[PDB]
Amino acid sequence: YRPTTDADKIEDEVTRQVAQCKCAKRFQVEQIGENKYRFGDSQQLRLVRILRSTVMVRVGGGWMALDEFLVKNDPCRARGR
Ligand code: NI
């Protein structure tokens, strides 16, 4: 394995950050195509892109960095909010 495509890089970085969850019921994230993800208990699909090496998640009309999205949504990260 060699990360080469944007889809590959995004998926690796989503994996790295989601793996930091400490919840009893882990915050689940699934790749649904090269550019859409399902996060946590929400069934909503979100676009995900990489821009200058930062992964961003589509949220209400704009883009939010992945780390901030996880702070806002993964219960074990709420103390960063
Ligand atoms: Ni968590």
Numbering used by the authors: 18 to 98
Study text:
To address this issue, we isolated the ACF7-GAR protein and resolved its X-ray structure. The resulting experimental electron density maps revealed that the asymmetric unit of the ACF7-GAR crystal consists of one protomer. The crystal structure of ACF7-GAR was determined to a resolution of 1.5 Å, revealing that the ACF7-NT molecule is folded into an elongated polypeptide that is ∼32.7 Å long and ∼17.9 Å wide. There is one α-helix at the amino terminus (α1), followed by five antiparallel β-strands (β1, β2, β3, β4 and β5), folding into a central β-sheet from which a flexible β-hairpin structure with a positively charged surface extrudes, and another C-terminal α-helix (α2). These features are interconnected with flexible coil loops. The microtubules have highly negatively charged surface. Thus, it is most likely that the GAR domain binds microtubules through the flexible, positively charged central β-sheet. To test our hypothesis, we mutated five positively charged amino acids at β2, β3, β4, K53, R63, R66, R69 and R75 to aromatic residues K53Y, R63Y, R66Y, R69Y and R75Y. Our results indicate that the mutation in the five residues almost completely inhibits microtubule binding with ACF7’s GAR domain. By contrast, expression of ACF7 mutant failed to rescue the dynamic feature of tight junctions in vitro or cell motility, strongly suggesting that ACF7 regulates these processes through its interaction with microtubule network.
